[PDB]
Structure formats: C-alpha cells, structure tokens
Design a protein around this ligand. Structure first.
Ligand code: AMP
Ligand code: AMP
Ligand code: ZN
Ligand code: ZN
Lengths: 111, 111
C-alpha cells in the first residue's frame, strides 16, 4: 500500500522492465549513472541489507544469484553490483535494491 | 598456492584483519576510497559473482549476511557494499570480494 518499490514490483507504478519472476523484479534506473543501470529487487518487502537474518540468508543468496544471471546477460564485458544501506550510503527507498552497473569501463573514484 | 586473496585468508600474506571465522576473512583495503573500506572474502576460492550457482547460492547468502553484520558494526551511520565482476567493473583479483564502504556521506557520481 505504501512502498514505491513494492508498487513498482506489482506494476502499480510504471517501470521499464528488464526481468521478472515470482520472486524478483528488475527494471531500469530512471536516473542512471552508467550506460547500463538496472535495479533488482525482491518482490517481498525487505527494508535493507541490515534486515538479512540467518533465517532469510538463503533467499538473499538466491536474489544475488539472479542478480548475476541478469548481469552476465546484460553486461557480458563486466558489471558492478552495489547495495546502499542507510544514510551515509544515501539509501533512498527502504526496500532492498541491488544496482547492476555496466556498459563502459566504470570509474573507481574517491567517495 | 597461487591466489593472492586465498593467501591473505590463510595469513600467508599480511593484512590488517577486521574479522575472520571458519568461512570468511575481512581485512582493510590497502588503497581505500572511503574512510572505512573493508574487503570481505570467502576463505574458499570462488572467482567472481558469475561463479554463483543454484547449488552455492545459500553459501553466498550467508557471506552477504556476514557482510551486513560487519557493516552495521563498523558503519552504524550507513555503508555501501560493492562487488566487481570482470573487465568493465575493473575486477583485479579473481577471488570474490565484497567492498564495505563508509565513514562519510559517500558520493554518487557518474561512472
Ligand atoms: N520510480 C523509479 N524508477 C526507477 N528507478 C528509480 C525510481 N525512483 C528511484 N529510482 C532509482 O533508485 C535508486 C535508489 O538507489 P539508492 O540510492 O541505492 O537508494 C536511484 O539510482 C534512483 O535513480
Ligand atoms: N594486498 C592487498 N591488501 C588489501 N587490499 C588489497 C590488496 N591488494 C589489492 N587490494 C584491494 O583490493 C581491491 C580490489 O578490488 P576490485 O577492483 O573490486 O578487484 C582494491 O580496492 C585494492 O585496493
Ligand atoms: Zn517495499
Ligand atoms: Zn582465491
């Protein structure tokens, strides 16, 4: 009812869809920082990486596996995966999302 | 015998250790790009995220869980987790390593 990414996952708010299945939903970042910039979310609401538990760690491993399958397909020359937790990382939406970044030789600059 | 991170994990090459257990090894990046910059590796040799399989996905979930435990302790104000796969991402060592970055409001710049 409230979470922007939960709603995107249920196609209640529009997105450019890259992949979806019963468990995950991947779509293009609307403000990209690389030529390929994809967000991968679980459909289920998990607020951040700090909400991973010993009991859901297998599920998050499966999400990361599916992140790799998307990345190796969309970015055969290589890709970077980023996850932001909390204020210093600039986490905006409190629904866990993996960034897949690629399509160029990606910078590695001081943060 | 050959992999720099396998050797660091077995303390055959020195590092500044942040945490270790029977499964993982975490140490300070020697060329940091943030005030807190930690590398977390499995002790077992896995070359990159592209080597995750349906059969080891639970293990990688556990590694990511332990990444979150390290991050929330070392970076209570928030942290970014990064993984680089292949040439465009600039992956140097072919032994999977998660970057934990924090200690400041981290930039989000074009790559
Ligand atoms: N409605 C949206 N559709 C697609 N991407 C979005 C939308 N709203 C925010 N984003 C992206 O979501 C990301 C949030 O990343 P983070 O800083 O890790 O919370 C940013 O890269 C935003 O550009
Ligand atoms: N001997 C070392 N000890 C600690 N960190 C290292 C060492 N060699 C390389 N690194 C770091 O490992 C990281 C490799 O990251 P990547 O570009 O993702 O392959 C870089 O941030 C390097 O500064
Ligand atoms: Zn949500
Ligand atoms: Zn190794």
């Amino acid at each position: 009812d409230s979470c922007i990414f939960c709603k995107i996952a249920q196609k209640q708010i529009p997105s450019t869809i890259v992949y979806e299945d019963d468990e995950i939903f991947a779509f293009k970042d609307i403000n990209p920082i690389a030529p390929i910039h994809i967000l991968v979310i679980p459909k289920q609401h998990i607020a951040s990486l700090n909400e991973i538990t010993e009991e859901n760690e297998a599920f998050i491993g499966k999400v990361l596996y599916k992140v790799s399958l998307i990345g190796k397909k969309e970015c055969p020359e290589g890709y970077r995966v980023v996850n932001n937790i909390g204020e210093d990382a600039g986490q905006t939406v409190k629904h866990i999302h993996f960034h897949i970044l690629g399509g160029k030789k990606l910078a590695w600059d001081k943060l």
